[PDB]
Structure formats: C-alpha cells, structure tokens
Design a protein around this nucleic acid. Sequence first.
DNA 1: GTCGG
DNA 2: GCTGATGCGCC
DNA 3: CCGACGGCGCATCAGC
Length: 326
Amino acid sequence: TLNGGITDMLTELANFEKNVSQAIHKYNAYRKAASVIAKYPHKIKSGAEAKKLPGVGTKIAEKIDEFLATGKLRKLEKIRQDDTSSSINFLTRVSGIGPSAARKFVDEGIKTLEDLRKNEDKLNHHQRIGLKYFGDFEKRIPREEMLQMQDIVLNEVKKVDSEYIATVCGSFRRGAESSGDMDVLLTHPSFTSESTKQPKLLHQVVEQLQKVHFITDTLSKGETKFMGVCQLPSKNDEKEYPHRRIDIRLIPKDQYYCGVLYFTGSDIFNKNMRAHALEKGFTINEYTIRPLGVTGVAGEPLPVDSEKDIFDYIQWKYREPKDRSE
DNA sequence: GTCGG
DNA sequence: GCTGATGCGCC
DNA sequence: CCGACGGCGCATCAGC
Ligand SMILES: Nc1ccn([C@H]2C[C@H](O)[C@@H](COP(=O)(O)OP(=O)(O)OP(=O)(O)O)O2)c(=O)n1
Ligand SMILES: *CC[C@H](OP(*)(=O)O)[C@H](O)COP(=O)(O)O
Ligand SMILES: [Mg+2]
Ligand SMILES: [Mg+2]
Ligand SMILES: [Mg+2]
Ligand SMILES: [Mg+2]
C-alpha cells in the first residue's frame, strides 16, 4: 500500500537494468532503494524526503519528484514502448532464460510464447520445463498449501531415515501468507564439515519424493542442491493444483545456523547483512562466519551456536525471520 | 546508482 | 577428462 | 573522485 507507486517504479527499473542493460549493480541499487522505501512508515511527499534514506541518492530522488508530479516516469514510458526491451523482459520470465539467452532468442526472431512453443528443439532442459509450466510458475502458493507441502516432505524424509531433519525456509519461515516456491534445508548426521560418511543423502530423499509423485521434474541436481518441480495431490473430480518450484539444499549438520540464516533470507536482507559483515571485518556465507585478516584473506570459522550469535559478531540486534522480509 | 574513505 | 570462465539459479 | 557492491551450486562450453 504505502509508497507502492514509488516501489513498483523502482522494481521495474531494477528489472530493466538486470534483464536489458545487464547492469547487476544498478539492479541491486534500485532493489535496495525500493526495500528501504517500502519499510518507511510515512507517505513520501518529495524526492528530498526520500533522499534522507540509505540507498536513495540524487538520481532516485529526481525520479521520485517526476513520479509524484506526473504519476509516470518518461524513461519507463519509453522502455515499455521499445520492442527489444519488451521482448527481453517477457523471455526472462521463463525459468532458465536469463538476460544473455533472451537477447540471443530475440536475435533469432524468437520473442513470443508462440515462438518458444514452435522452437522447443532450441531450448535446453531447464528452459523446456520453464516453458511447460510458464503459467503455473507465476502463481503464488497460499500458506495453507505450503503447510500441506511441508507435511508431505517432512513425513517422506522421515520414512527414508528418522535422522534427517528437513526445515522449510524462504518466505514460508518468515511467516508470509503466500510463497513464490518451496525452499527445503536438509541435514543428516552423516554429512558434516569434517566428513561425508554416506553417499546419496540428497539423492535418496529426491528419489522418495519422486516415488510418491510429489517431485514431477528436475531442473538441476548435484550432491548438495536440487532444483525442480513438485505438485500436491488433488481429490476425486477436483481440478489439479498448479506445478510449483522446489529447491532442496543439503547443508553440513554442524553448519545448520549459517545455513538456515542464508536460506531464510530475504535475498535483500542477506545482501544487506553480508555487506554489513564486510564493513565490520567479517565474511558470512551459508556455512561459516570468518574474520578478514589485514590481507583481505578470510581466517578460521568462528564458533556459532545460534542464529543470534551471527548477529552478535557483526553488532546487529537480532531480527526474527518475520522482520527479514521486504 | 549509491556509498564511504 | 580436467580446469577455469560464464550463465542462471538460490536466499 | 573512484572502487566496491554477497556468496556459492549446478549446467555448459573453450582450451589443452
Ligand atoms: N570507450 C571507452 C570508454 C571508457 N573507458 C574507460 C575510461 C574510464 O577509466 C572509464 C569511464 O570513463 P568515462 O569518461 O566514461 O566516465 P563516466 O562513465 O563517469 O562517464 P559517462 O557519463 O560518459 O558514462 O572507462 C574506456 O577505456 N573506453
Ligand atoms: C535514472 C537516471 C540514470 O541514473 P544511472 O547512473 O542508471 C542516469 O542519470 C541517466 O542515464 P541513461 O538515461 O541510462 O542514459
Ligand atoms: Mg527471470
Ligand atoms: Mg522461495
Ligand atoms: Mg526457491
Ligand atoms: Mg535458529
């Protein structure tokens, strides 16, 4: 609601920089500005008011002044009218089509949904599945369906080995009423930072979920990360549920707190927290928090016994998952 | 595009 | 076959 | 002004 006009404007500029300009730092700058404006609890009355927030500079203030006076941004009005920008912005909505592949396809005269379904032989495995479920993948998952999905995954993993722990992360763990997809963090005692005492720990879980027809497709799979497609079972005479994206990440059992911090997000929160860690002389990834030596070389992993320990190292007050959303 | 040294 | 670069993905 | 901007997994390809 509040400042929705401004944040939508900034998100559309971010998407343009990422998809068309291939300018990843401008994309990140627009998104950081959109997120700080979304959390601001007043109706922004001027560019000058917004410029006081961290991540809003001169250029964004000037665009906020235009938007508030005219309800439009001339630059976005032009981009919307541009056939190449339009085509690329549409193709990048297909899972597996990034900015580079989108520009290549536009060059070959492939620029609509009809063009893609004619040219499937030109798509890689991932792109083919993104095309097949194009409609399904733009739908959000109601929390009630996420609870049904949680119950299937936790119960199936438990049937494979009572020592697995599966945790639903992403927007679900931040308490969202709807989720873009299902993100599952997996641990097993056999996989630690010190040892892999067992092979196929991720594979055996994927296989069981395929066997009860929950996982329907694979986009990618290695030893620690699965990316694919799943679907809730429906009743007699009921319309089928949409196909959903599922990500599964197997994390060393001893590095759970770093792993769950990473997988809980949001992505903007992780970028902000990791950028703050560097200013405080630390580096954070999904496994460890490590000091930076005078060098700029990461040192030994610091002890972590809680999510909050990570916040304490970088001198942040703890934020509950619910308070890490945009 | 913005920030901090 | 291996290794390093790049694309696309995740939060 | 100007260098840095988060960090890493898997798929794919060029060069040896
Ligand atoms: N054809 C080019 C253009 C630029 N550069 C280099 C020179 C500078 O080190 C840097 C950018 O210089 P610019 O004059 O482009 O500076 P800005 O990017 O700030 O200005 P502009 O508003 O023109 O983008 O890239 C280059 O090597 N070859
Ligand atoms: C939004 C205004 C732009 O800020 P950035 O460094 O992307 C520039 O001031 C205008 O640049 P252009 O419109 O992309 O040439
Ligand atoms: Mg996309
Ligand atoms: Mg998600
Ligand atoms: Mg996901
Ligand atoms: Mg915790």
